[PDB]
Amino acid sequence: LKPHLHKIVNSSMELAQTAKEPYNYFLLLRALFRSIGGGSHDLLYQEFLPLLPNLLQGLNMLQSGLHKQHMKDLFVELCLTVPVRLSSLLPYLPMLMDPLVSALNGSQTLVSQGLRTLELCVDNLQPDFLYDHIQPVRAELMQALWRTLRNPADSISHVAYRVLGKFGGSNRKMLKESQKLHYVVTEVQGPSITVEFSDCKASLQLPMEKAIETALDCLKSANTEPYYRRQAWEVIKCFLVAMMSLEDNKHALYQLLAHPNFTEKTIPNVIISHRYKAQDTPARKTFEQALTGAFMSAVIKDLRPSALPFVASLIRHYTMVAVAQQCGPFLLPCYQVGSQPSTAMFHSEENGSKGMDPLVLIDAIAICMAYEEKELCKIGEVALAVIFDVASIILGSKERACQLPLFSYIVERLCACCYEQAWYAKLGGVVSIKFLMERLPLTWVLQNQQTFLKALLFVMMDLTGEVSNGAVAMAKTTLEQLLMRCATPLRAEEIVAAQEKSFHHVTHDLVREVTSPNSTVRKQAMHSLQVLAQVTGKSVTVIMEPHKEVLQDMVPPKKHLLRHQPANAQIGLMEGNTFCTTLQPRLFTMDLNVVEHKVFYTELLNLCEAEDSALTKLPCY
Amino acid sequence: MTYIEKRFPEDLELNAQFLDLVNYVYRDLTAKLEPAFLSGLRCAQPLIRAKFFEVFDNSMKRRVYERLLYVTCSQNWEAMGNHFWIKQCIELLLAVCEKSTPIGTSCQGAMLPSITNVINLANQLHMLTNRHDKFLDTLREVKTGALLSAFVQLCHISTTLAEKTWVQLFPRLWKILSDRQQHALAGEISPFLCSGSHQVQRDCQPSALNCFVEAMSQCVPPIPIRPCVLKYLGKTHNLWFRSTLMLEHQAFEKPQQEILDSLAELYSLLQEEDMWAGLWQKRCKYSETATAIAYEQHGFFEQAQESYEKAMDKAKKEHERSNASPAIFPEYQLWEDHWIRCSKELNQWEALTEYGQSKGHINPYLVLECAWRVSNWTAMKEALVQVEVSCPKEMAWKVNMYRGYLAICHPEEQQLSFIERLVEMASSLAIREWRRLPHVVSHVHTPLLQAAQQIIELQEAAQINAGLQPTNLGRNNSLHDMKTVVKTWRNRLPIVSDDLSHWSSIFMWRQHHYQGKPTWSGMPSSNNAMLGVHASASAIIQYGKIARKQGLVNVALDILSRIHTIPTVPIVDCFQKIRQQVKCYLQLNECMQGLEVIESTNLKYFTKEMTAEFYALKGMFLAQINKSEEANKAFSAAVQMHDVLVKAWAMWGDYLENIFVKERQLHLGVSAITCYLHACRHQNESKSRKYLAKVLWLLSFDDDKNTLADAVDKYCIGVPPIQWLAWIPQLLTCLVGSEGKLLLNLISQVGRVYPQAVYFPIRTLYLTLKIEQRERATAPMWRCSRIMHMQRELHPTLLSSLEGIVDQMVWFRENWHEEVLRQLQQGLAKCYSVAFEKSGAVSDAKITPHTLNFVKKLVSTFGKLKGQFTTDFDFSVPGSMKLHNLISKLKKWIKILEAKTKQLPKFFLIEEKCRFLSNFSAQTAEVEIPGEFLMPKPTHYYIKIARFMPRVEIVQKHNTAARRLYIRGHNGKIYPYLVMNDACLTESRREERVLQLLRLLNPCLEKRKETTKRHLFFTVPRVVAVSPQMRLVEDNPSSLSLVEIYKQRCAKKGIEHDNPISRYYDRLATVQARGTQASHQVLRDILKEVQSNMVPRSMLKEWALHTFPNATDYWTFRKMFTIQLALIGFAEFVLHLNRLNPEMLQIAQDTGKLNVAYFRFDINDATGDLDANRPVPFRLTPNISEFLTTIGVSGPLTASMIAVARCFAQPNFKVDGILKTVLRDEIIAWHKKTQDSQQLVSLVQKAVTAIMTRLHNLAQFEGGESKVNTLVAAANSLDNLCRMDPAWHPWL
Amino acid sequence: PEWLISEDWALLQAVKQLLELPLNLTIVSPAHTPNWDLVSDVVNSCSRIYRSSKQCRNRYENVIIPREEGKPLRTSQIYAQDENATHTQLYTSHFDLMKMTAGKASVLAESGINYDKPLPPIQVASLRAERIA
């Protein structure tokens, strides 16, 4: 096994990033470490040493990031338990410490694993050296050591207490970072439910902040018994039908929604945005938490029969509220023709909407998308269709319902999921882009064409590290379809103008990204033009011709001293130059005689001809 | 039922349901089946639970009052001790509601509006609307009983919900009860709390009583609870801080002393000695007790012990003539308890053991602790047996250990075979109590963490004796079991903050084995006797080493006197003895004795390295006394003998500098510079800033021919550049000034290794000089450029990334709306400050020339069409005649723009408007977190940049809007940085200066005990500036300034935060208009009336109470708040800093840390007078004091200020060097602003000597309380407050 | 183990915070379950040696119950009569115990050092470099 032992680990780590299901790749290492660990420790241990820097740095990066609970539990386990004895691990010890604090939190088997590694490290590293390496993490490590004493498992506590004793005085040394305290920022009454007794017919208002959160936590939990799941659903349901005011019926409702004007008048062009959302006040925070509880209670079996007909009928209600609040007939003043995305459209404690805003539904839908358990995307995707369906029916036309100000928030909020650091949160965004693209009118997609393009590129750019359980692979496909959906030639003047304008903007962004240092986004930007070159009859250079202003100062590198940029950018400048020139129309003829071209051409030459290490190994290199 | 439950916990379904059928038999007495019926109420199967509930629900009236009595009095909760039985109580009461009424909610504001509600504010469709009405029709059928049934069930599975429900429930339904019912209910509640049924529930963490007692406290009509029981409940049910907090409240407002006794004991139990001390100083009858406590509170246990003994005899004279005066007994008990404590800290273990076993009134507990420390085991065994019978408390963990001590060090012959159970039993028992302590670890937790170190030592101590047994003695494995464990002990020590008594515990216990070890080797080529004696010799020296570090020198001499008894010591250990002995005399006719030991020792034998250190001590000791010329040769011989001893080099330099400061002898200065730099050479990182500070300080005396600088340049080699990182701003101030070309050879070496550390400062300086020059390349600018030039050649990738980051920074500057509003806020503050200066004179006053330029500059940037035509019209002239009329105009325009900026975006993504930051990644370039190099941290501990989070939030800072961009370090943590953009670069640089000082002083606090014992540090934020204008400040969210607290509750109130200042001036004008000048009394009147009408005394307490509902969180936040304000208060006074305006103090809600918003030295513009003598020495104010008055101000604050002041007073910490260097740079900046040579020395030297005057004046300890008590009393005295600037918000 | 008088009054008052004379005459109408730990806690405020909860109950049920019943002076009446003299006598005796306890250079020449003449650091610094050479 000594031969191609590096290939197993080196490939496993790099493959795990791109692969859709990395869990097997990391489980492979866990199997490897157990087998090698304590069973074959003559040559593999020596053969393992070269792997330690990248491997520990790798594994350290993964646990530092945020993945699914079961995934994270494995990661902290791999950072520890490596088949390297006490010695030869000290140089990389700082990288191991961050897992150690993580281990002391979480699963019991991890806590014991964390103490087990900490226990041995305490005895063999002499206090002064070990404590120094604990300084970066001591603020949270010690608080974890103190906390684990209170844990119920006696074996965990006794071991935790023993190590604290071994930490002679360091266990009680003053902490630069004090223990974080729990403070309530909002001094307002949260959501409550009227309760009346027979005693002098007096009434109370028992707060529901914990109950709704507690009920939701039960639905999140993967091992709550079915009875309490049903009760959790009942608490959430009974609360929603409490905050939701039932003050309309049939004739009163029909006349408002059968009105002229809002079915014929131009829909007001108001842009919503959570940029101006002051803060999630406790009601809105609870209301959003209550809704995501309703959405989750719909997906899980043995509760869908009484939930899906509820959430489905509830989603239709909120959209009817949103439309009636921001459509032709009356609309609140915050949605008038020339208004701006003020805070009046979000619930707030000083200038809210004097009543919960319907947009909290979109927040609940977005949070369901970003939930780690991706099964919730399906129920959320149902909601997006339902609000669109009600909007189409109530406004009398598809493209009209899409012009509604509500969808300006949906595109913004769901796209925001692509800017979260968790891969699952990002994947929730990309899936949302795919759904909206394929179920919405072409012209509207053109209106939000660029917004999706930028978000998709960010997901790919952001995930150059451990990519995902298949996100960029999903992002690239969605990006490809997005250009194909929009760039496909048609036929009315209105649509033609939008496509010509939208196509103009998108190519501007793609050309800008040709030379970008990020390899993942760069190559796709290179490839995204190719699909455009095929979708339409226009040649690649004809597509890139108008936006020469962008790349103009780089294809010819403008003698930007070719050391003041890192290696990654130098690849982008060279790769962008290669792609730009290689096109058979060959934009930006790189004439040697012209200045700042001979320089670039000579530099890449000397770079290639550099034979020895010293000349090849420059400070940038 | 008793047997079935325990044996088979999975088949109770058949039985549990059976007892439900027994409900019929009870009516048709078998009452003894209650402890199974109650176990059926909890169960785990929901179906059975409801079946048992119906009989329980049936058996009582459907009245809220009756059920409350039933839960309190009628019911017994003993049967279900392990359960959190409050769940049933929540279920019991929630079952009395009206389950039929349709669901609703009082908070109509939060309800989602109905579809048709928009009207009131003024085919596919019909099927949908018709279909929808059915859905709404179903909702109308939901009844509140549906929620309560599900609500109640949800509690049973989640204690956290149950715990929060009862606290939110009982006070709410407590209102429902009529005042008659509440009266009777309160009568039953008091006996209920102290009932014995809850006794079973002490161990379980969320104790049912803990949640119950927490709930009642919120009841709006206060429920009277005896202080005696409140102490008990706090002690047992982990309810510590709610009891003390609740006890404090009544103690403040309200035979009225039983409260203090209960409160006093709890503070002692919590080990909050400083808070405990404050309480007793207020109530102590005898003046002796206050003197004793004040001494004991800080150390000097020699004085405190005597002050107690003085009190007792004087009290003894009282007894023979007077009666008992029952109230005095707790005071007498205090002296006996604390005279013993001080006796322990004094190492008077022999006397205590003799005292403890007196003829009568024996004290077995006292004998237990002290008897074993001396070898009097026979007394130990006797004491242990008679205390085991009454081992009453947590001590059980302590008692169990002492069995091991007797087991190991048996009076005749040990067994050490069953000890494993003993140590394990004690360890488990110790953890048991730990579970009973508060949530946040604090001083109350110290004994357990303090003990954990010694409980383990007992276990591995048994391993020592096991090896000594002849059965396994002499074996190599056992011998190496002896060696390693002894080595482990030598490196595992407590911290200096630990009381010397515990330090004895670790070492006295270790001493026994260091004496058992020689015995086995005394039987043979057995050198292990040398190892054993070496251990005891080193251990006793180490144990006595701290006694000096603690300030108890006299006992330290005694401990170092013990080693003489041991027959032989390794010569290396004896060198520590003399070094520790000579150090002891150095810290205190004492010269003769010190000179006796130094001369007598080392008659003819020692090695080179140890001789030098010894001879080094001679010079420093000689230097103290007048005889000094002999010290020089003592250093010369010492330094040159070893030539690599930092102490010789450093101490020698101090002598040369001490002489050279007078007579300005140039050749001596280079002698001082050479010594200092060489000392810092071998020394790495810390413990060299003190020496470097001198080198930079002495560099100011350099003449035109830069001899000292040449001396620096010649000998600044070898000193690793890391040591310089602390002095980058000081170096740059030298580089920009004259003779910089000499230092440029040094900075280039510092930058060559830490490019990010110098580039950001150097970039600021060069760009700062350029703008300075452009106002009207120069050599200083050329010097800065040369550093960057070469510094770009190396790490070219890193520098490009840095500049790229700064280039993108320009996009974070606030828009015009915020920019102008910032000018208004700045202008208004200056007008108020100018306005106060013009007070007393005509209140109308006149607009100052400086104010005109700002307003004239304001219209220039303003002159937005709708606003424009109004502002220019309103500001028809840049201030017409009246200053106090102008502020009204600004305030109106403050409100206009403040609302205007309220609608501005709170978000804007990085990828938008700036691409480099978003495209930045770890592989782009290794760049450390901004401000990482501000302090040369010795260890690696450097966090790279990995990703600029794509979202930046726009936030308000005191009087400006700043962009907060979140960084993600390579470690995965998120560091929120706040991009501060500001003009007036000269002021900004000064603000960083004081922060450098506070960062330089922080290591000072750690070393000593009386400061480390209180967790004292300056929490200086990390600020690195990259511009002449903008800078990055490490802002942690949730930190809101004190003034913002006033606005928050002011906004809730029906007033505006600026009403106090306006009322102060207009009220002053009315009296001034009549003709009478502003007298002192009228200043008190306006302050008093404002404090009683618009700014209530309890403003800050109200916010803290509502923001920290959890008791444990409130106290710790208050304690940390009080401690931090002490350092701020001390720093604002001793360092002669700018006054602490309300907007300056930044309170961190998450941790309680207070960091002042950019302090700065208060130097007179005309001259470097350094005038900081405003009426109140430091901000104490009513509201802040109201947070802490009775104890917090007295005990913690006064003690905290004294502890810090004494810490800096230590001659060992060369604060003179630190202040002189930093101030020198400050003075240079002052000179440039006001418009070199030795005249600089006069300003800085006179300034520092002014600072040390305050430091020593308020640090010196007299025969009683220190001078701090006077100023803090003067700080909050209304006489000084009313005289302060109204903009300072003295009322606040 | 030394018995006191004021501690008996502490026992009485502590019991008055819960039940009645025959401790649980009926544990009072409701179930309040006397808490001897609390009674032991309060009595310790006026003592220097812990009165364990188990032993605290025995003293109440052994001597206090008969003495309180009477039908010697009542425990309330002895305490007033004593004038707290015993307790003062106790601390006065303790104070005496504490007070009574409270009563108790040619080596340099052999190393090449010309100790008579100091060497300025400049020469010493230069001398240091030479040894490196």
Author numbering:
A (entry chain C): 732 to 1221, 1226 to 1356
B (entry chain C): 2400 to 2427, 2435 to 2528, 2586 to 2717, 2740 to 3008, 3025 to 3089, 3096 to 3283, 3293 to 3379, 3415 to 3786, ...
C (entry chain G): 2366 to 2436, 2442 to 2474, 2495 to 2523
Task: Provide the authors' own sentences about this structure as they appear in the paper.
The human Tat-interactive protein, 60 kDa (TIP60) complex, a fusion of the yeast nucleosome acetyltransferase of histone H4 (NuA4) and switch/sucrose nonfermentable related 1 (SWR1) complexes, is involved in both histone acetylation and H2A.Z-H2B histone exchange and is essential for cell viability, playing a role, among other cellular processes, in gene regulation and DNA double-strand break repair. TIP60 can modify nucleosomes through covalent and noncovalent mechanisms by using its histone acetyltransferase (HAT) module and its E1A binding protein P400 (EP400) chromatin remodeler subunit, respectively. TIP60 consists of five modules, including TINTIN, HAT, TRRAP, ARP, and BASE, each with distinct functions. Within the complex, the EP400 protein functions as a major scaffold, making interactions with all the functional and structural modules, a role similar to that of the Eaf1 subunit in the yeast NuA4 complex and of the Swr1 subunit in the SWR1 complex, the two subunits of which EP400 is a merge.
